[PDB]
With several copies, the nearest count.
Chain A
Amino acid sequence: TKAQPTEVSSILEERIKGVSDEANLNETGRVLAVGDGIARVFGLNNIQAEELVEFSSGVKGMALNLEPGQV
């Protein structure tokens, strides 16, 4: 029914193929849609509010919206 940003085929294919739904949603994230000056990382559910994340690219950014499934 509802459309959700958690309909991502790369996320979905790994949740379905086990009882495992990814341990890459703890203290790690993997980037998705990025550019326009705003970026969307999937996971990071152990995170703090107004925290700094450092991306492996030599760019760091500040979590603004902690949403359930994305930051």
Chain B
Amino acid sequence: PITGKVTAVIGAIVDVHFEQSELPAILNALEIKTPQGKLVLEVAQHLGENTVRTIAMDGTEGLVRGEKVLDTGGPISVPVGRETLGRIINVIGEPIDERGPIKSKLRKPIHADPPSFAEQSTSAEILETGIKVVDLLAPYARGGKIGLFGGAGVGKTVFIQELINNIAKAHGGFSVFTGVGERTREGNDLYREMKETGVINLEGESKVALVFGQMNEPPGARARVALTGLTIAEYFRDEEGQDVLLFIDNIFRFTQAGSEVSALLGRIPSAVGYQPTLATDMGLLQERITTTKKGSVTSVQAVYVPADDLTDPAPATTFAHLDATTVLSRGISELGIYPAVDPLDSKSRLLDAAVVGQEHYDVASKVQETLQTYKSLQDIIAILGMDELSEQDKLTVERARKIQRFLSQPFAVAEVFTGIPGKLVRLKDTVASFKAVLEGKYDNIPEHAFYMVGGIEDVVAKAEKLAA
């Protein structure tokens, strides 16, 4: 195609002036030949007169005005398929992990238009997992956005790994873990850990494909990595009809990087010191995530708060898009309960009477109510003393403590540490257990004998083994 010479290099904002006919279309990918590899620049304005204004994806160093530029004919094309899994790729779709050129039968553009109105999630759908707490009190949905909360390295890794594992059994599906604001030291550790726990295999295919966006690559390479993983997911959905689960890391560092992209292009970064095109960018991102007729991409995203504020613009824009929140905490982990889920802070807007049937909602309300009433009682029960307990009151205490222990999964991802064989407990089977405990048909079974087991079947065994 058409060729032109670089006519500016201000900041990481490079303008290229082309021989007169036309300019690249907007969002297209340009390739610069230099002895610094390649530099792929993306057009985000037309200045007119056959000139462009671009953002950089690769550091801007070893450029000279007068280097010849090439126009690909469209967005940056990332590889897709099932020959790309378990391998770490940067924003241009090429290895960081140095295991040899990451190529596959087909490539697809990072920017795409979202499906039609007709082909969106138009009716309710339920995405079944193995965890009891998620499936009862916050049901994961297809095309559902569930915003993860809490810190990294207390359970966070264990939680991510688990769900990747569940999906293969459930459908035959895949996942792509996308890391935005990724630290390179941490990245090696996540890929080695992911190998050990059995979700990335050194011989052929795997499950999850890793996408890392390092901080030693410009703001655009942090921004477009989210788009880079999405394309992979979609290929399974559209042309192989498989369900996917797409993680994002911190959504603060998607916001942090986008502010720089705004401020730099000519635009004003005003939105309490962030971009004014923030809402509209999340709109593009989280409206290609949905249930089509052949498959569906679902997204788990991570919320990082700016200074412990849920009243800021960036938390706020995220909270509107999100349909459930899952809340890992450390307190839970210290009582020997893995998942780290908080059943008091486990909530969905897809937890209703008509979305999961009536039975599912009504058991969930009771399960929530027991634990809430147990907490209120517990305030003055500790202070007054444990013997100023009522007959009525100690009935609430007893039920709650049975439920608290029963939730735990000795699941396959954290199997090594406790020593206890893995569990996947399906959504229908979660609801069913909770019905017998509500009518007290296991008030002959001790409280502590609900320890580290899953469904209804599972706790038959532990009861015998405690007595024995």
Q: Which residues does chain B contribute within 8 Å of A58, judged by CB atoms?
A: none
Q: Tell me the count of chain A residues lying within 8 A, CB to CB, of chain B.
A: 21
Cβ contact within 8 Å between B9 and A66: yes
Q: Are A67 and B8 in contact (CB under 8 A)?
A: yes
- Smallest CB–CB gap between B19 and chain A, Å? 14
List, in ascending order, chain A residues with CB within 8 A of B63's CB: 48-49
By the criterion CB–CB under 8 Å, are A66 and B44 in contact?
Answer: no
A-contact bits for B412-431, CB 8 A (1 contact / 0 none) = 00000000000000000000
Residues of chain B with a CB closer than 8 A to A54's CB = none
Give the contacts of A8-34 with B (CB-CB under 8 A).
Answer: 8-10, 31-34
Interface centre among A8, A34, A49, A68 (most CB of B within 10 A): A49
Please state if A34 and B46 are interface contacts (CB–CB under 8 Å).
yes
Count of B interface residues, CB-CB < 8 Å? 24
Contact of A45 among B44, B48, B66, B265 (CB under 8 A): B66
What chain B residues lie within 8 Å of A48 (beta carbons)?
Answer: 62-64
Contact with A along B164-189 (1 / 0, CB 8 A): 00000000000000000000000000
Nearest B residue (CB) for A57:
B25
Q: How many A-B residue pairs have CB under 8 A?
A: 58
Shortest distance from the beta carbon of B60 to any chain A beta carbon, whole Å: 6
- Given A33-B48, A34-B46, A36-B267, A66 and B61 contact (CB-CB distance below 8 Å): no
B62 close to A49 (CB less than 8 A): yes
DSSP class of A's interface residues: helix, strand, loop or mixed? loop
Q: Quick check: A65 and B62 within 8 Å, CB to CB?
A: no
- Give the chain A neighbours of B43 by CB distance below 8 A: 35
Also in contact, A8 and B10, with CB within 8 A (given A46-B64, A48-B63, A49-B62): no
Interface presence of B119 (CB below 8 A): no
What's the least CB distance linking B350 to chain A, in Å? Answer: 33
Interface SS of B by simple majority: loop
Known: A34-B26, A49-B60. A8 touches B49 (CB 8 A): yes
Q: Does B7 contact A (CB under 8 A)?
A: yes
Q: Evaluate contact between A66 and B49: CB separation under 8 angstroms.
A: no
| A66/B267 contact (C-beta < 8 A), A33-B46, A50-B61 known | no
Please tell me if the beta carbons of B60 and A68 are within 8 angstroms of each other in the complex. Answer: no
Q: What mask results when residues 255 to 298 of chain B are scored 1 for a CB within 8 Å of chain A, else 0?
A: 00000000001110000000000000000000000000000000
Instruction: Return chain B residues, CB-CB under 8 Å to A47.
Output: 64
Pairwise interchain contact A66-B48, C-beta atoms closer than 8 A? no
Q: Which of B8, B9, B47 contacts A35 (CB 8 A)?
A: B47
- B65: interface (CB < 8 Å): yes
In the complex, chain B residues whose CB is within 8 Å of the CB of A33: 45-49
Residues of A within 8 A of B53 (CB): 35
The B6-37 residues at the A interface (CB cut-off 8 A) are 7-11, 26
Q: Is the CB of B49 within 8 A of A36?
A: no
**Contact across chains for B66 and A10 when beta carbons are under 8 A apart:** no
Known contacts A35-B26, A36-B267; is-contact A49 B9 (Cβ 8 Å): yes
Q: Which residues of A contact B44 (CB under 8 A)?
A: 35-36
Instruction: Give the shortest distance, in Å, between B109 (CB) and chain A (any CB).
Output: 18
Which of A40, A50, A66 interacts with B65 by CB under 8 Å?
A66
From residue A62, how far is it (CB to closest CB) to chain B in Å? 12
Smallest CB separation, B67 vs chain A (Å): 10
Is the beta-carbon distance between B265 and A36 smaller than 8 angstroms? yes
Task: Please give, as numbers and ranges, the residues of chain B lying within 8 Å of A36 by CB-CB distance.
Answer: 44-45, 265-267
Question: Which A residues are in CB contact (< 8 Å) with B11?
Answer: 64
B278 CB to closest chain A CB (Å) equals 14
Q: How far is the CB of B375 from chain A (nearest CB, A)?
A: 47
Q: Can you show 26 pairs from A to B with CB atoms below 8 A apart?
A: A9-B49, A32-B48, A32-B49, A33-B45, A33-B46, A34-B26, A34-B46, A34-B48, A35-B26, A35-B43, A35-B44, A35-B46, A35-B265, A36-B44, A40-B48, A45-B65, A47-B64, A48-B64, A49-B9, A49-B64, A64-B10, A64-B11, A66-B8, A66-B9, A68-B8, A68-B65
Given A49-B63, A66-B8, 13 other A-B contacts at CB below 8 A? A8-B48, A8-B49, A9-B49, A33-B46, A33-B49, A34-B46, A35-B46, A45-B65, A46-B64, A49-B61, A50-B61, A64-B10, A66-B10
Using a CB–CB distance below 8 Å, which chain A residues touch chain B?
A: 8-10, 31-36, 40, 45-50, 64-68
Which 9 A-B pairs give the minimum distances between C-beta atoms? A33-B48, A35-B45, A32-B48, A66-B9, A49-B63, A35-B26, A33-B46, A67-B8, A33-B47
